[PDB]
Write a protein that binds this ligand. Structure first.
Ligand SMILES: Nc1ncnc2c1ncn2[C@@H]1O[C@H](COP(=O)(O)OP(=O)(O)OP(=O)(O)O)[C@@H](O)[C@H]1O
Ligand SMILES: Nc1ncnc2c1ncn2[C@@H]1O[C@H](COP(=O)(O)OP(=O)(O)OP(=O)(O)O)[C@@H](O)[C@H]1O
Ligand SMILES: Nc1ncnc2c1ncn2[C@@H]1O[C@H](COP(=O)(O)OP(=O)(O)O)[C@@H](O)[C@H]1O
Ligand SMILES: Nc1ncnc2c1ncn2[C@@H]1O[C@H](COP(=O)(O)OP(=O)(O)O)[C@@H](O)[C@H]1O
Lengths: 712, 551
């Protein structure tokens, strides 16, 4: 409980902290000594304590400037420690800030030397910002350097130096060197995993010695481009507070031979010198790509040198290596063996909550208009990684500038601040920017989370129970299976008429067990077969393993029934270990062309027939579609359900869509000539008159015959 | 020992001590008794007592070549033998020597060779020897043609009469320039495969000698459940289990009291296995099997025929030599699917205690299309190196061009008759099999595999259910009688369906051990929910084919 609550202070003094005597009693502090207050992200300061009985016990009084310097807000908890090693300063060097001296010239250092340090003995520390009043201005300077270390106190005999040039303020902010856990959202699981795999070796190495194990060193995080890998690495490095050193694949690969090895050796040696340290790499694929395609000697020697350096790392050393790559399988396989990068992590596209958090983080400095509905943007935007969200915000701001430019004239070199005061980003700007966006992650197989429950599934209760017994029990009750000795099956294959609710079933299954759904359509398999596609099935299954538990989906599996892809799929699936929580769900409308090998035990052996929806199922599905669209009061869907015998979910959805389109057209005409913003009976009448069936009766008979044949 | 409580520690019987990972004697290796013995024989004797070779008057062999799946401890094995013999050890990396400049690699090589020679009680251990001297037909570049030539010159120019032994390691045997296999070079071949259950148990004991294991440990169970795991995988599993234990204990967090409570339990090992993934099965490997003869049921005449075919020629080769008959090696099992052909092959291999090798249809197709890590040549070379062995070719009807068939025929013809290499072929479509493979001196013997009989079905049911609980008083004879016309696969499916029903009932009861076993009603429900997977047409076709063959 030594931590104390941060409180707003009316006083503007930069070297006085007022606390109650009971606050000293808690730590048994003695009057007349400075105290060290440490906040977050390795931010600390030393303040002269005063007794103010007015303040209630546990309440402090620190000006806003000190809190801003510490990077903390009101109401935070800061650790307070005594100052047994209080020391005075012998030589301090400080420089001014040019933007803070605007409007007044001259040398105010001499003006501030005496009045501000007249036997004050104000404790000082590296990087502190202190504000002094000169003439008609209040100028803030920074503590460039102080001796003796580490913080010391500003004694009168201390020699003060001011020989140098002013340094910008926002330059430090944009350095990117200061980013904590707060600057990331939507990666709670991956962030926690990285923290566990990094902090423990560095913060508490004694655990591994106590338990008798060599702590892991090789951590490899991979994900879609522009997903925040570098930002997450920087954030964790700063939060740890250990020494940092970064290597860029493009940078190292851009220098002639020899120089690359020299740089790598120097980096490793320097990191070893200043342990604990973290070594980070970027685009490790570029320096160590797949050997099967790059036969050049330069990359061979570079990768060999990297391997030798990794192997030669001493047994006991607080150094952790982190690598980044878009393709998990692109890097040379030699790096993935034990004693090297083995702790693999996959980062997927953020879900709705992740998108909301990212948008909140980015939209923290722009002049957001009064009417903003970030929740709606999060709901609409799917498949957007953080980088695309930042681009969307930038484009919306650009559109706002387009709208507001008419007031000003661009020829003049100055813009009136009155216009600047009016700048604001409205919802329409975000809508337009979203309309002019271009997501790219979704075009490739990427792991994403789904949140579909059994409610969305319109019926098929028996299939629901069968699927539950098949999947959920081994995922949440493996003890029973181990006790009985029965291994869990993994190969499930749905077959039936198209548009009967298969993908939604797979999503629901993935949601129930809280697993990362993976989608792989038949065209993707065909492209992989022809080689045009980048990722291969091996990559898909490696990502599935790294993201376990997972549910992989194979749509139109008959579209590849080609034999090489089938053979590779069989090999990868059989190689999978059953104990791992990995499941494959195949779908096909023609369960006859599939090669017999796929149906062997230990593979896609479970066969599930998907029948057409029943009247109750049709009614439930229609209700599910009609959740946001207002309906004519008294509208009855039972007649529609009864008149739609043999229909499929897709056909019912299209019926709803055409009815909505007719209602919209009627509204347009009425408005041109919104009193009627909903649908009425006539639209449904037209829709049902324009009804049909996507499946012929012959196909239904064939499906029934095949299902009965499989039963017998 | 090693040319060396406090006294014992000093004689080996602050980081500079532990980091110096040396003196790793025979104690720190398990599951490689045969290979360890071979390497010891080929290393210690030339070095320790070269006088013996002079006395017998013959030059000791020097060129050794080990190969095995990656991460099997080849480098560790070389280091251990070098430390045991007390001599100096040298290590070279193939990519490293290839990494350096064009002329720099040749320098490195010659300087290392001369430095070793001047001070040469020692072993020169090359690594990734394939990289420096890959298959000549594939790469013939300038540096590729230069470094290999320099290495060949150095090897052939070995001064002899010295105490230098050269050892090379490659994941695949037929992945180096063949010129290195001739006499006066790497000739003594050694194969290392995935260890058996005993080897994995030994590895686990070796690694788990410092970790604070919990009170209850069943390393025998871990060895039984872990199959196809290399030593590196075992070490990774142990590390993962320790990490899981640390994570579990991290929720309460340093005080020494908590550190004193650290303990690795069975749950941690189970979780680590759940998060493990061995990388050895996908490649063809050599192992051992222990399929007991009495394990299977029925087919007694087939058992006796196979015994006469395999055991007697190898058990009493003197009789065959005196008569002159050579051992039979071409056998082809044919019959309906799911009749346990692989089980019979494994049992036969266990009879002679040979190293069983398996090749599946997907591997055949991968080799056919050209995209595959290894070709039939590698499989046969490993079979020869690890002799005696029993190679199993599954789904010979899946190679329906003819390049793979021609290669297989050539390899089968090439091997010498005396060498103890046997081939067992399996196929459910005997018609498609190429007639050429049926010629004398090849896969000539045909063995029909009939479906199991009532007694065989009962034996199969009993064997499969030994490791599963059952209701006391249950009679499976009625089940066996009421399952005529089925196969082993159908019986296993019914058993697993009954187990699934028991699991469901137990889970529902716990939600609401009431039934830790399976009752008769469960079997009744399973059988009523399952039926034969083989039609009568297939049986009639098999009978007709058998009669035609008899004719
Ligand atoms: N939570 C977040 N997740 C992802 N990107 C984020 C997040 N918050 C901000 N960003 C923005 O994303 C970019 C940071 O990710 P970055 O572009 O470095 O990822 P990357 O593609 O993994 O990088 P690299 O260039 O190292 O391969 C910056 O634009 C940052 O503003
Ligand atoms: N008897 C053993 N067999 C296999 N591995 C073992 C054995 N004893 C220990 N190990 C562990 O397995 C690994 C074997 O050594 P190492 O990691 O060098 O693999 P390797 O197969 O020799 O490597 P490479 O072939 O790539 O040079 C090490 O982790 C070693 O600790
Ligand atoms: N139980 C259900 N049966 C059929 N369709 C359903 C069911 N529940 C919902 N639907 C609807 O079916 C439509 C088609 O879903 P989709 O996954 O494309 O089907 P498919 O996988 O058969 O092509 C979706 O709009 C979905 O809302
Ligand atoms: N005597 C036996 N005859 C037939 N099958 C058996 C026998 N003993 C065990 N089995 C079962 O046969 C199964 C092997 O099936 P499968 O691999 O299809 O046979 P094969 O590959 O030899 O055609 C094993 O799971 C095993 O439980």
């Amino acid at each position: 409980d030594n931590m104390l609550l941060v409180d707003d202070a009316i006083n503007d003094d930069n070297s006085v902290i007022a606390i109650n005597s009971n606050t000293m009693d808690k730590l048994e502090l003695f009057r007349g000594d400075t105290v060290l207050v440490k906040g977050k992200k390795r931010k600390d300061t030393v303040l002269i304590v005063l007794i103010d009985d007015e303040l209630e016990d546990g309440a402090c009084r620190i000006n806003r400037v000190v809190r801003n310097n510490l990077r903390i807000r009101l109401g935070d908890l800061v650790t307070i420690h005594p100052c047994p090693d209080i020391k005075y300063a012998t030589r301090i060097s400080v420089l001014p800030i040019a933007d803070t001296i605007e409007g007044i010239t001259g040398n105010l250092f001499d003006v501030f030397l005496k009045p501000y340090f007249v036997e004050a003995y104000r404790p000082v520390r590296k990087g502190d910002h202190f504000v002094v009043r000169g003439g008609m201005r209040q100028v803030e300077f920074k503590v460039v350097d102080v001796e003796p270390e580490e913080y010391a106190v500003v004694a009168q005999d201390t020699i003060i130096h001011w020989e140098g040039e002013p340094i910008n303020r926002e330059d430090e902010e944009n350095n990117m060197n200061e980013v904590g856990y707060d600057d990331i959202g939507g990666c709670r699981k991956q962030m926690a995993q990285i923290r566990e795999m990094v902090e423990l070796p560095l913060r508490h190495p004694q655990l591994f010695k106590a338990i008798g194990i060599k702590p892991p060193r090789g951590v490899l995080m991979y994900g879609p481009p522009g997903t925040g890998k570098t930002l997450m690495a920087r954030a964790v490095a700063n939060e740890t507070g250990a020494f940092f050193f970064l290597i860029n694949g493009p940078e190292v690969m851009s220098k002639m031979a020899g120089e690359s090895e020299s740089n790598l050796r120097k980096a490793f040696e320097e990191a070893e010198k200043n342990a604990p340290a973290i070594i980070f790499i970027d685009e490790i694929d570029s320096i160590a790509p797949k050997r099967d395609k790059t036969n050049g000697e330069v990359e061979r020697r570079v990768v060999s040198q990297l391997l030798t350096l990794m192997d030669g790392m001493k047994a006991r050393s607080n150094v952790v290596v982190i690598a980044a790559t878009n393709r998990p399988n692109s890097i040379d396989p030699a790096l993935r063996r034990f004693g090297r990068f083995d702790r693999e992590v996959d980062i997927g596209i953020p879900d709705a909550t992740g998108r909301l958090e990212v948008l909140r983080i980015h939209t923290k400095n722009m002049k957001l208009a009064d009417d903003v509905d970030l929740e709606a943007l999060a709901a609409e935007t799917h498949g957007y990684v953080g980088a695309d969200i930042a681009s969307l915000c930038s484009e919306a701001a650009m559109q706002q500038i387009r709208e507001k430019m008419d007031l000003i004239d661009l020829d003049e070199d100055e813009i009136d601040a009155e216009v600047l005061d009016s700048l604001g980003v409205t919802m329409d700007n975000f809508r337009f920017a979203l309309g002019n966006s271009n997501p790219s992650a979704l075009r490739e197989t990427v792991v994403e989370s789904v949140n579909v429950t059994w409610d969305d599934v319109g019926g098929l209760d028996e299939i629901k129970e069968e699927l539950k017994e098949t999947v959920e029990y081994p995922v949440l009750h493996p003890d029973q299976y181990t006790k009985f000795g029965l291994s869990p099956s993994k190969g499930v294959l749905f077959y039936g008429p198209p548009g009967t609710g298969k993908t939604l079933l797979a999503k629901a299954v993935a949601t129930e067990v809280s697993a990362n759904f993976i989608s792989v359509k038949g065209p993707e398999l065909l492209s992989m077969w022809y080689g045009e596609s980048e990722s291969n099935i091996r990559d898909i299954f490696d990502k599935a393993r790294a993201a376990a538990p997972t549910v992989v989906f194979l749509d139109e599996l008959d579209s590849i029934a080609s034999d090489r892809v089938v053979n590779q799929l069989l090999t990868e699936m059989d190689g999978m270990n059953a104990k791992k929580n990995v499941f494959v769900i195949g779908a096909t409308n023609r369960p006859d062309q599939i090669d017999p090998a796929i149906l062997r035990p230990g593979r896609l052996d479970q066969l599930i027939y998907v029948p057409l929806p029943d009247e109750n199922a049709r009614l439930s599905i229609l209700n599910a579609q009609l959740r946001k669209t207002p309906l004519e009061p008294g509208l009855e869907l039972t007649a529609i359900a009864k008149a739609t015998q043999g229909f499929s979910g897709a056909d019912l959805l299209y019926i709803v869509q055409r009815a909505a389109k007719y209602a919209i057209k009627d509204s347009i005409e009425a408005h041109r000539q919104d009193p009627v913003p909903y649908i009425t009976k006539e639209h449904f009448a037209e829709a049902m008159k324009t009804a049909k069936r996507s499946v012929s009766d012959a196909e239904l008979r064939r499906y029934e015959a095949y299902s009965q044949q499989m039963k017998a």
